[PDB]
Design a protein around this ligand. Structure first.
Ligand SMILES: [Cl-]
Lengths: 217, 215
């Protein structure tokens, strides 16, 4: 009875993480896999304290006691109501500077830095100042509120797992309108079980046709 | 000209957003404030005047509050594509087929909540799930199911979320359903609330659903 504990940001369950876990489980039938939802920031102390062994997060927070590998970047999209003018560009995409005067829903509401830190930074990076920002608890809430007419939201491509009536996802074309997925571990040599997790990630990414790959070590 | 609406978050996967949007369009001078909260919290929020209408998954009887059952949603079983239960997707399964499986209950908010009704419908027929685990919200349950951890009972509107190798299987028990309520203060007579009711009626009519009662 050996155990690996994995922390993850909840919204990563809309992407490739469940496939990664499922394959990892098939490869390690004797392994107990414990899954703990937590924000990226929370994963730092969880790793240092040994409450988790690896953390899937959406940014890199530097702490000397942990280390990181960039798995991949997801494209950001603009979630809009179907009646919004922006939806006419659904098949071609828009840019950050098209969004400045819109009501933007940011998320999550957990301690900073979090997903939304980078979102605001990419605006600032090009001298853009969004004039109307609201923070909500998590992405699926933001999406439901967009469908209800509450504004727009910048969301990872993976959230297209959620399809709602009159909700549309519009591509964001700025090359830096992307959001990273990181794996974080203690700053020491990975265990055999963590190395196996890396290989499982590599395998799922190979199925998706991603190239790096990814990268790794 | 401000209306405050409380809602259970998972209701945003069904008809509620299109109801709110149609309602909003018809009231350009109305400020709509939307508050995510469990059904238990809506009851106190209504009595305390913090919201004007609450959309919930259950009825908490209180003399200060009046409820209207909008409709019942079918419950479905979320399973991994490879799960034996997914071989009965066309015909459906019954609650008594689920009893030996690891069932993911949710949410972890204060009780009573959606998981209360789910466990009650088993209890109502002398069925006791042998393996249960409570998770925070529906998307955690769904992701864990897709990851191979267990199964979950969910409202049919959950099918708005489609994950790789996640399948939804109909339940056949007539009472394997989950209600959607609107709750308002007992002496509520606001024109904006009347309009909200009528907007629900319009959307339901378009969907071919039964027309909700009083009002
Ligand atoms: Cl989120």
């Amino acid at each position: 009875e050996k155990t690996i504990r994995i922390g993850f940001v909840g919204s990563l369950l809309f992407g490739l993480l469940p496939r990664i876990i499922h394959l990892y489980r098939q490869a390690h039938p004797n392994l107990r896999i414990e899954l703990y939802e937590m924000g990226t920031k929370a994963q730092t102390e969880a790793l240092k304290e040994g409450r988790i062994d690896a953390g899937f997060g959406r940014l890199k927070i530097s702490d000397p006691a942990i280390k990181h590998s960039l798995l991949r970047n997801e494209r950001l999209m603009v979630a809009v109501h179907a009646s919004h003018p922006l939806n006419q560009m659904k098949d071609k995409g828009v840019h950050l500077n098209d969004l400045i005067d819109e009501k933007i829903l940011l998320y999550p509401s957990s301690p900073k830095p979090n997903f939304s830190t980078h979102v605001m930074n990419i605006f600032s990076d090009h001298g853009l100042e969004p004039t109307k920002i609201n923070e909500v608890r998590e992405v699926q809430l933001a999406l439901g509120l967009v469908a209800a007419g509450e504004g727009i939201s910048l969301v990872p491509a993976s959230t297209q797992s959620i399809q709602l009536f009159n909700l549309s996802y519009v591509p964001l074309l700025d090359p830096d309108a992307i959001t990273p997925i990181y794996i974080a571990v203690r700053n020491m040599e990975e265990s055999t079980y963590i190395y196996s997790l890396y290989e499982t990630i590599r395998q799922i990414y190979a199925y998706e046709g991603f190239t790096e790959p990814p990268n790794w070590l």
